[model samples]
Target: MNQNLLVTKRDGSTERINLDKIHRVLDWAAEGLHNVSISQVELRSHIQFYDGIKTSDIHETIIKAAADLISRDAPDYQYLAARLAIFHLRKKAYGQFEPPALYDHVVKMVEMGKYDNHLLEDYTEEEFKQMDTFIDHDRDMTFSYAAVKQLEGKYLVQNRVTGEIYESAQFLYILVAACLFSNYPRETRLQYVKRFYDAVSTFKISLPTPIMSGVRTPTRQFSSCVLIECGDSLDSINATSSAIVKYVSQRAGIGINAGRIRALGSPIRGGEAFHTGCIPFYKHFQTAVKSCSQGGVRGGAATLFYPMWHLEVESLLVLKNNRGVEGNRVRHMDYGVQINKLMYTRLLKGEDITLFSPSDVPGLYDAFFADQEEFERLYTKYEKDDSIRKQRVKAVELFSLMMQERASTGRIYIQNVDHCNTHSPFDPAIAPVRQSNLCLDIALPTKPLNDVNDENGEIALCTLSAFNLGAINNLDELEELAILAVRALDALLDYQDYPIPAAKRGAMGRRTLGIGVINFAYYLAKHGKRYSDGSANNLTHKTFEAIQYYLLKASNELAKEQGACPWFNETTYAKGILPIDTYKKDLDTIANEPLHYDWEALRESIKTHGLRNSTLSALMPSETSSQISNATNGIEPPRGYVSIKASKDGILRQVVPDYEHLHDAYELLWEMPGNDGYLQLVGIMQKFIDQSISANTNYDPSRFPSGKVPMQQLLKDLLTAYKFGVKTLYYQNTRDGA
Candidate 1:
């Protein structure tokens, strides 16, 4: 059909469809890209010239053509596609690089109730206009095609109701920097803002998804993880459920510790009736979470933790198993065991351990051992009391069942209460530590507080950000980045709108900041060291040592400026103790790699100046944000030399950055022996990290008979990890299916 399509050009003039213009667009996209030969002649023939196909549609069609041509060898097509899209986004958002117009648009969007009103409260209209000077259009060129698309879909600001996208990458970064640094003094606010902008725009580091994408927008809740405490009473349980619903609505991942709740058939209702226990409540909790989607994108992710010695221990263990009936099984929820010293002792001695109901034996779950003898004393007293002992089973039997479930399903995570509390230098006596977040990365002392309002207890909140290890070139940059990241995250405590009163108070009172790392494998590979090499281990040790040193120094500096976190006097930091001291014995025994800093000096400074954040670092899976930054996932090696990534736009082939130049190092990732090296590296890094590392354990199905390992060998590997002082273990993956 010979049709002359009328299309609106960028200048708002009407024009007929011209293949020459399309060829120019294609040529622009393919500029500076190596080994990417785009045939604009061939591309022009595929366009069906229909009536009224907008010029924007032509650009999109070109993008799609480039995207469709993605291959392993010619991955630059993806970048080419992204460049065209970024060009489109830039033009649509800024209308020919007019920064002042974009600033006015921000005000207009806020006035129209599309953006946050705080945008006005935080900055003057003139100041917003001045920010136009800082907007760098060149920064848009940094993102890969997939990265650009990912940012547009999930991160970039848009119209709430009409869904009209606005804001370029520089616009988003400046907005985030403004919000995160809004609490700073007027004299220094813009300086801090520019620093934050530089860090983010350069892809040196990434703020948490909620903060990076949600801050400065009407839909803002900047925290990622909220750890809720479930009390033993029916009122508290219902209250916790309601609290979870509210938090889930705000898109916070929940980790509720239900170990304190009484067991199945335990006495309740003033001893007149028996309670159905944790599973029935969790079953309802799981269903409630499944019903709510975080911002209409995905269901609320939750992990319910129960201690191994609860009277309903057997039920909790089988909650995720397929053999159980649908009514009894809460398959959607991730489950973890709150492993403590008593459980380990009983297992080691082959003793018969008695499970107890919290109603019958009070304070067993609440009390943590300062030493092994303390746990033995408390546990032995409970075991000898017949009224408290609801059921008795061989300790080995409980251990075997846990291993069996893990080997079969790979859903059970082992979080050591002893290690977590011992390493937690902030508040050992404030609350009984029981569980970790959904990813098993964050472990802080969490308990509910009796408040003036309807709120019962403090739910832990983790405001997280990660360092792009691949970007740091020297120690000075690392220190500068660390200080900025910590300060920015700490500012969230003042500005964030918490979902509940308890969550607000809990976050502010503790003042926690989860400082994790991404692109760790990229960092390793860039240094020309294999993951299993000795140099890699030493680098891991030195790198984390540096991060910890600077982070503490940064928090101390903040403390000097803004005062230490509430309850600072109660922490070990006040007693001239450090994170290293808490795990000194373990480090002495297992950590062969030497640290780079003078920790004794850092400890003294913290004692005098205090710290602004309670928990400084926590490692997470960071799958989405890592993909956005084109970095490897947190602390894990690349999945392979090459892999297919299924994305929202379409399936695209991805290669590890720099994989083409050093295929040998990329191949070493696949050749590494299972999760053993990963675990050892985690153990070494765990020496410096105050919070837990979410490390996944992988198994080879080919090595196992019938795709399942023997319980003994699995147990052996787990015990090895525990002995090496791992605070928590996350997902379990097998070569076949788990």
Candidate 2:
């Protein structure tokens, strides 16, 4: 056979390819870079050119070459790789892309019944046609190679039968903006849409995965995480399990409170005998989650929370132990200890902690700490009344069991109930924030909606978006994006497709919004600050202060337009108390820093014209979005400067952003005993943001001090986090290879 044959171009023309054409493509991709070499000869030598090689095949080769050349030392190759990949995607999605044909594409998809018809319902055909001008295909070049790859694999629109994907990064932004603003007045809708387009496409902010991937599509749900409260009755317990299955099937992460459930050997029905406790239901819920998959992405994820005063608490704590039997274990499910002031006092003083059943102490779980004295008074009264007590055990023993579990499986997590409720602006009148969302970043109040209490209870939903602070050049840009993000999330709450009535009721009632940040680690590193430095803490503090100040101001503006959330009466905002005010009062005695924003003005604004959202901020584990933005994970330092991995092609080196320039300052997140630094940073952040922080502690057993054991260090770190007002601790990871 002849070595050279004809291959087809995207235009359906035949062409013969050779080494020089490869060099031309490489040269074109590397045209305008500074201090860079394309090294066409070296790249060409690695290519196995053969007969009948399609032009698309050559594009793939270029992408692979550039991608392989990418590292911390020469990260510029990623720009070239991204351009090549975008070129390929453009050709594949649109035959000749000047910009995408948004109107034509949507009409075609809708006619075929592949898209949500609401797009046509809200906008006229002529209006859709006019949207073509809004598309700027050049912005597609802003993505890194990894981001483009991730988008194509997961988020881009595709035909269900033919498996043909047709989406550009610009089109994605346009689609989301169009869907989110569909119900707005026609006069200002396009203006708001354009603003949303500029914000997202410019990488000023990021929308959550569900909103980004599913907003304009036919098969989609818009909420990111679901929080549920389970009652002690059999009906409510079964209903909670059913809710978990349904929510997980729709790709929403779940967190449920099992604290109200009766304890072991509690009386059942009218019999003298007793029944097994929450452990059985806990195991059942674990199986329910495992039975379903989250949109075929992965197995369903969930976390279960139980209060400290339960008779079967010991058994619940050991459910994740590797040495446990399969019948007694729920290995895939995560567990958290609901910590209140009473538990801490007991552990500190080596006093006895009493366990009780909600059946006997009817309103104990329903109560919350107005202050330390009140909680102590209520809890000590219960201890005195032995009728409600099921058992008494030394608090240190239970605390030690938790630490041991944390050491082995890293399964134990903590949620400070007193701190979470005291600072919560939405939960004061209804109920305490009982459970958080799947990542422990969301702490809104949730309850089972029954015929008797429908007016008072709601299941919780949290919508998320974040700012890419690494790309933000100034505080003004940060403030602009922060405000825009709040508006977008509020709009999403109005337009979201809820999987259950409970989620919808909760979302619409409270309109809770999560405005977080990514590339925080990059921001710290860019400023030549270490995570352990006091200067880093100050910046983190001031940055969050500014973010919250603007966020509340933005929400206040929205309130004037769209009205405050339904559950907004008699709360902190309604009483002229801002998050900063709470921070000021708490920080006075908490050994923490003070807020730097204009507190008096914000408080007055909030008091006069309520806020659009009940909760404003949370930090998420930005696993996918971080990959897309080419930034660090949520408020976390770089995992390392260099990571080595073995693949089919050979070894690959993955580096953090600006790793070459900041090598001296970049510290491996697990290298040092970083508990103190992590605590201080989270403590400061908690004061600024109304919601919780999803913090993870890296456990290194070998780093115990000269006279301390590993368990002692672990216990001390856990206690330190609780004592410092860290609202929630997500997981403890062994630092062996972290």
Candidate 3:
């Protein structure tokens, strides 16, 4: 209660700190957590306040005080650090003047503000009426320490008045919730807000920190896309190509396709010929990533996709091996392979495949979808029985080499070209597609718009917004509810601050965003959709569709405001905006620009304003973000109802609740599937999410609990992903050295 109280230090020095200082520090410490006061009390007991303590001393006292508390209860300490850090931030920043959702909603609300005539054509009147003008202030208290810390410290803006910090973690949470809800119907936004708040406060789910302690956080913070060019000309090689790496490093995510290099033994600029081949080019890429850190955070990452028929397919597989020379390995980066139905047939028939540098192959990479059979036939016969062909390898033998590479080095990603094309919502004009970003999730055609000659050219910027359905109290309101969150998310488009111009265009044209779910299994558990029960199967199918239905509807509504992307224009490619020579002619039938999706009204909207973003939805690795919601990672089942992770202290801890220790939450939790059974569930979930999800699909041989590598699981994972419509996938397995 006193402003000055003297207490002696353990070293016999004397100092004085007021109760207000202690309380201020305590409030600063507890901003993001539920039990901050208790933790601060424990922390205070450890401090030996003395006479005239300096300000820096006070700061150090809080940190050491918190650290000591953490040692007693690590998890709680983690939660407390998040709280104190965030509280300090709130004390140092100003609140936002307008939430994008409120800005968008008010406009819509004013235009359609009338009770019966509210223009929320997407939502019912009763839903709109239920929401209040004021945000629930008490609910603001619910954020986990981590979320709170960010709002005050990193995310808050400076106050204009008195130059004093003024923003509260509570306000930011509500604002984002409003943003998510504004894009959707009123009901959707309300439900989303409630659940989002609960998740952040409760620590059921979470989002990644933009200011990660390590590596770059994709596309330089809020960026959404990264595009790269693929060719081997002097301009392409020495200048343009190298610069793209810089762009990707500074930004975060990237999408590149190597379809234009001359095949293994093609002609080159100098007197010397093309002798070394494509694998060696990738080898150079390995060295390039050493210094060009991503988003200025960690080592840069990329998706190196080559046509399946590339002459060096066998060699590319060895890029991840430690036993190989440095020239053969690009281990720090992700690897991807693009395949057509024809390539699949070749594998099935055990036939010979041709390999040409992209420069010679020309449109082959772009057209693998439209006319695979014809292209293969023409190439096979065009060479006149191996006349001009440079290199040839058995399809099965290539498979063997790829497998051996995986067994040796965990590199090389493969995509289902036919499936990606067939199930794609973009339809006709979108080309057969090529590769994805470094993480093997996005499967767009070529680079963002055109290739940027330098890394400063164009970057792919991505952001994620997750839907937490378990928080929805009523299943009947789910459809309307989902739409609210979506609409709010759409508002983010206008308010978004892209890192660069191309990224802005890339997002605006296609309106592409990654909208996904967390705690899918937990939601199922809440809904009685048990993994083992037969009824669970049917429920799974319906639940996913409902999510997709609402998501699509909201995106369509946003299209009205932003306009469809140019790629969606029926005549853009034909008018010469798109390079038709790079793609196949047959695809022209379906390639009608924005083809397969729910195009009825969107097409008309496209004719009106031109959509705001290029690709509207994507699935990302929201590992931490999902944790705040207590949900499973994006579109995934509980990794093992009980997987384990290593702590910073070198101790291994279990993530799942032990069945034997089960109580209320675990009463009817989904049980972990044994090996084969587990694969079945993974396969089934993959089927419904048409787009590729970022999951470590293949099993790691060395990571097996027993050790030394088990090849069967890896094969099974590949088979599961392929059988399902998963277009992109990744492989990661941890070894137990500790």
> Which portions of model 2 miss their true places by more than 4 Å?
1-15, 18-20, 34-37, 40-46, 125-130, 160-163, 270-274, 294-298, 368-374, 427-429, 449-457, 584-596, 642-654, 705-709
Lowest-lDDT window of 10 residues in candidate 2? 584-593
Tens digit of lDDT per residue, candidate 3, span 373-480? 556666665446444455777876776566556555555677767666655544533444555676666655434323443333333445445566555564445555
Off by over 4 Å in 1: 1-14, 40-52, 95-102, 269-274, 294-298, 369-371, 449-456, 532-535, 584-591, 667-670, 736-738
Error of 2 at 662 (Å): 2.5
For every model shown, what is its TM-score relative to the native structure? 0.93, 0.92, 0.69
Q: What TM-score quantifies how close candidate 2 is to the native fold?
A: 0.92
Model 1 score (lDDT): 0.75
lDDT of 3 at 475: 44
- What digit string (tens of lDDT, one per residue) describes model 1 on residues 591-694? 46676777888788888888888778888778777877878888887767555667655665555666656566552444665555667678778877878899
RMSD of 2: 3.2
Candidate 3 similarity to native, TM-score: 0.69
> Clashing residue pairs, candidate 2?
none
lDDT of all predictions:
0.75, 0.75, 0.49
Listed per candidate, the RMSD to the true structure in angstroms reads 3.0, 3.2, 9.9
> Candidates 2 and 3: which is better by lDDT?
2
> Could you tell me the lDDT of residue 676 within candidate 2?
76
